[PDB]
Amino acid sequence: KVFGRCELAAAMKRHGLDNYRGYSLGNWVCAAKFESNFNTQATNRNTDGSTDYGILQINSRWWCNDGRTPGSRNLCNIPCSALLSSDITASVNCAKKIVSDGNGMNAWVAWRNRCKGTDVQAWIRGCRL
């Protein structure tokens, strides 16, 4: 499913992401925008052989099992395919474990390079939340 901007903001809010670990909702919508262009089915292969999955491009070396990243952990206890669903619950629940890991949202390279320090509030303006 390719989410609309306000549609995604509303689903992330319902799932507890607004201000989760101090990151307001615009940060999460901005990160999803640049990580997957709001597409739940996005996948990208990395040079080390791991793959990033779903709306927030969660990586298979640490967070999910895809059966082809040798020697990887599965810290969210999920198959990576679960992160490609139209239902974002699995991606949200795993994202909460990642952002709590110590480096906050810097775990998402596109957030760090394209959202951090910007007016992320613009990503939810106009949405009935």
Side-chain angles (χ1 to χ4, degrees):
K1 178 187 186 317
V2 181
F3 280 81
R5 179 171 64 88
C6 293
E7 179 184 24
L8 182 60
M12 285 177 149
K13 186 167 180 172
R14 185 170 68 89
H15 286 95
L17 287 183
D18 188 14
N19 303 122
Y20 186 83
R21 275 214 132 218
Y23 288 92
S24 69
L25 204 52
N27 287 101
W28 292 105
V29 177
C30 186
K33 165 70 181 171
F34 290 126
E35 288 295 345
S36 68
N37 196 38
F38 304 141
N39 185 178
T40 61
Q41 293 198 79
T43 59
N44 216 88
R45 190 86 195 260
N46 299 125
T47 50
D48 63 355
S50 68
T51 300
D52 303 323
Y53 295 83
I55 201 135
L56 284 165
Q57 289 291 276
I58 290 176
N59 189 256
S60 61
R61 161 68 273 252
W62 298 97
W63 303 106
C64 59
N65 176 244
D66 61 5
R68 61 170 208 186
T69 310
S72 58
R73 300 188 186 181
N74 176 10
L75 296 165
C76 290
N77 298 118
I78 45 169
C80 293
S81 53
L83 301 175
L84 305 182
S85 177
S86 46
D87 182 338
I88 63 166
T89 300
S91 283
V92 172
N93 285 351
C94 187
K96 287 178 170 174
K97 196 177 284 184
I98 299 174
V99 76
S100 301
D101 206 41
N103 299 300
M105 281 195 78
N106 297 109
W108 287 275
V109 182
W111 178 81
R112 201 193 317 134
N113 288 332
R114 302 180 76 177
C115 304
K116 193 179 187 174
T118 70
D119 182 20
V120 294
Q121 301 85 311
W123 287 103
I124 59 177
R125 282 199 249 285
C127 303
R128 188 182 291 125
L129 285 172

